[PDB]
């Protein structure tokens, strides 16, 4: 943020940005509020 | 009273391991530092030709 109008707030692409790997890194977790994911639709059939 | 620990002081070295993850860069342990995590080194084979 330059003069804090600047550098708002950074959403997530909706193509790819929630990656599957990533996530929280260390055992004694924080267990944070706003949690994000990925899911299919419900026309792709279920396999394991 | 239902517990009773003895606290004592100890002369913790590691000699042959480093650290593969640690949360910041600084001393003075506090709960973050309660997860962090080592790993071994690699071998070396010092030895006559």
């Known amino acids: 943020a330059t003069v804090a109008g600047a550098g708002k707030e950074i959403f997530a692409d909706k193509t790819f940005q929630p990656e599957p790997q990533v996530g929280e890194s260390q055992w004694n977790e924080a267990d944070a509020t706003a949690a994000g994911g990925r899911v299919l639709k419900k026309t792709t059939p279920m396999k394991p | 009273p239902t517990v009773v ?19 910041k860069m600084g001393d003075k342990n506090a709960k973050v530092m309660l997860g962090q995590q080592a790993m071994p ?9």
Do not use: C, G, Q, W
């Not at chain 2, 042959?16 to 949360?23: A, E, G, I, N, R």
């Not at chain 2, 690699?42 to 030895?47: G, K, L, T």
């Open chain 2, 5 to 23: 620990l003895y606290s004592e002081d100890v002369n913790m070295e590691t000699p042959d391991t480093h650290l593969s993850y640690k949360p």
């Open chain 2, 41 to 49: 080194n690699r071998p070396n084979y010092i030895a006559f030709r």
